[PDB]
Design a binder for this molecule. Structure first.
Ligand SMILES: Nc1nc2c(ncn2[C@@H]2O[C@H](COP(=O)(O)OP(=O)(O)O)[C@@H](O)[C@H]2O)c(=O)[nH]1
Ligand SMILES: Sc1ccc(Br)cc1
Ligand SMILES: [Mg+2]
Length: 170
């Protein structure tokens, strides 16, 4: 089979995880998607000439059993850590996602990309500088996205694939 990349989208409720995922998979924006639905999506794409399958888990937070969270963290190859640029708490929450994923995977080298979504809004509480500073401290890429306009969406997911490739070649 063609290579499959298992990507997991995490972040606080309301930041735009579902809207980002649906833009990637279906190329349209969704005003409303039930905040409590978690699902696994698939899409065949070409990234730098490689035809590959993206498996994308659009997470929704707590699971029936915590073992389910640990399972997807251990299985997932790369993580999009999403906050919204107008939601400071969601940005603060990134620290916990970073830690928890590394903790489950028992690894210091986990492919991740920091995503600041809702960039189409002038309303902003998290400046680009602050997010850059955090990404710098993690040694991971940072991309500002808008699920609404699609700006940065392919870059976010494709950059995460490229981070997974760098990890695999070691
Ligand atoms: N303006 C704007 N609104 C967005 C964007 N992404 C998501 N939203 C809105 O933010 C709310 C939460 O989005 P959703 O995808 O359900 O977030 P999730 O809980 O992280 O899955 C919804 O009202 C979306 O329409 C974006 O890039 N720009
Ligand atoms: S679609 C999908 C992606 C990543 C995991 Br881990 C599980 C399901
Ligand atoms: Mg959602």
């Amino acid at each position: 089979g063609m290579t499959e990349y298992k990507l997991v989208v995490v972040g606080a409720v309301g930041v735009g995880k579902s809207a980002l995922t649906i833009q990637l998979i279906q190329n349209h924006f969704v005003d409303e998607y039930d905040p409590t639905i978690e699902d696994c999506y698939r899409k065949q794409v070409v990234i730098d000439g490689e035809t590959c399958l993206l498996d994308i888990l659009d997470t929704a937070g707590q699971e029936e059993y915590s073992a389910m969270r640990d399972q997807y963290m251990r299985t997932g190859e790369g993580f999009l850590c999403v906050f919204a640029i107008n939601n400071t708490k969601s940005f603060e929450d990134i620290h916990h996602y970073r830690e928890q994923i590394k903790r489950v995977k028992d690894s210091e080298d986990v492919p991740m990309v920091l995503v600041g979504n809702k960039s189409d809004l002038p309303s902003r509480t998290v400046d680009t500088k602050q997010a850059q500073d955090l990404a710098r401290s993690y040694g991971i890429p940072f991309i500002e996205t808008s699920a609404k306009t699609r700006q940065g969406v392919d870059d976010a997911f494709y950059t995460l694939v490229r981070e997974i490739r760098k990890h695999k070649e070691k």
